[PDB]
From a paper:
Among these, ORN belongs to the DEDD superfamily, comprising 3′-5′ exonucleases that require a divalent cation for activity. Structural analysis results show that CpsORN is a stable dimer and its active site is formed by swapping residues from the other subunit.
In the two linked uridine (U-U)-bound structure, sufficient electron density was observed for only two uridine molecules, although five linked uridine (5′-U(-3)-U(-2)-U(-1)-U(1)-U(2)-3′) was used for crystallisation. Even though a partial electron density of the third uridine was observed, the intensity of electron density was significantly weak. Meanwhile, the rest of the 5-mer RNA are located outside the binding pocket, in a flexible state. For this RNA-bound structure determination, D163A inactive mutant CpsORN protein was used, as mentioned in the pNP-TMP-bound structure. The last two ribonucleotides make hydrophobic stacking interactions with Leu18, Trp61, and Tyr129 residues. A more detailed examination revealed that the indole ring of Trp61 forms a hydrophobic interaction with the base of nucleotide U2, forming a barrier at the end of the bound RNA substrate. The side chain of Leu18 is located between the bases of nucleotides U1 and U2 of the bound substrate. All these interacting residues act as a wedge that may allow CpsORN to cleave the exact position of RNA substrate and guide the 3′-terminal exo-RNA cutting.
Residue numbers in the entry:
A (entry chain A), B (entry chain C): 1 to 181
Amino acid sequence: MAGNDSNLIWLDLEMTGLEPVEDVILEIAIIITDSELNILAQGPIFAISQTDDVLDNMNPWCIEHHGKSGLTQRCRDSEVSLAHATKESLAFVQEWVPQGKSPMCGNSIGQDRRFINKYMPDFEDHFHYRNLDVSTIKELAKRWKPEVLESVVKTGAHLALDAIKESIAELKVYRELFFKL
Amino acid sequence: MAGNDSNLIWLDLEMTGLEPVEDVILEIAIIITDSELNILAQGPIFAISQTDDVLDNMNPWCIEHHGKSGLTQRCRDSEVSLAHATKESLAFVQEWVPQGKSPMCGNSIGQDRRFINKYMPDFEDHFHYRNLDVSTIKELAKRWKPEVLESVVKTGAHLALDAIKESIAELKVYRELFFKL
């Protein structure tokens, strides 16, 4: 099933803040599912090597939340450059889905896409221009059928890996309870 | 009914191309709906003043399509500035939904957002950070229930209200046929 036109690239980034103009990427994880949301593969996980003054002067939210998740320390200890993570990610994703076919999948994935466009345009090129944004459906559920949100489970932050598994599980809940089979 | 929390702000833009690094906005159109997708208001439509330096040197797709469309000439005839379009759009929108409540709605509305974020920062501030991307559901339809696309009405009209009302209507189809409400 490695090359199916309908497979999906799921990803989550962690950043030093919200604005691509000043902020940089700290973490990347990728999961490939088939079109039915079965998990076909996990990409490597990269904490991105960043200097201490970058890590120390990020967003208050980020100091707290990345400090808590253990990401900050993992970037202190990493030798991984963004340049390397971009090559590996692109090669992995190429191994699984044809160029141009899969939209970018995840929660508020357009935010991530801003960072990928600016900092990893080679990687972005493998994707379709479309976004599969799980938060779109959450917003429709909030207004159309909010009790569905009760079945949605949100665990605590560790890896970007975990945040992706949450997005998939969330969409899986919607498929079962919110969309018509 | 004015200023209700679940009211939804819809928009489409037309541009000189795909890369807002140095591409610009040709047209702005905005529709408000309640949470049921009932159209509550049409917003000021704005073709944006661009010199022939800009209009002559758009992409091939844009020269040919914005030419038959009538928009290129409208931007040449147009007196309204970027700031005036920003100031007005913000005002209209401010009437109909409280601040931070509404995601930004439309097809691939993240692309639009990149242009709104750079050239109209004040306007984007009124939205929730979330996107409501109908094309997310179109991507799911294609994979889960393609028969549903048959009822979607895609003319191919690349204008202002043209493509908006088509995004709103496309969501209405999904609501009847694709969602379990």
